[PDB]
Amino acid sequence: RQIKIWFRKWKK
């Protein structure tokens, strides 16, 4: 749900 570190790795 945070999708912030993720958005920082791939391109969520």
From Swiss-Prot:
Record's subcellular location: Nucleus
Domain of life: Eukaryota
Function: Sequence-specific transcription factor which is part of a developmental regulatory system that regulates segmental identity in the mesothorax. Provides cells with specific positional identities on the anterior-posterior axis.
Misc. remarks from the entry: Loss of Antp results in altered development of the embryonic thoracic segments. Overexpression can cause antennae to be transformed into legs.
UniProt family annotation: Belongs to the Antp homeobox family.
The protein, known as: Homeotic protein antennapedia
Species, as recorded: Drosophila melanogaster
High-level lineage: Eukaryota, Metazoa, Ecdysozoa, Arthropoda, Hexapoda
Gene: Antp
Range of the intact protein held here: 339 to 354 of 378
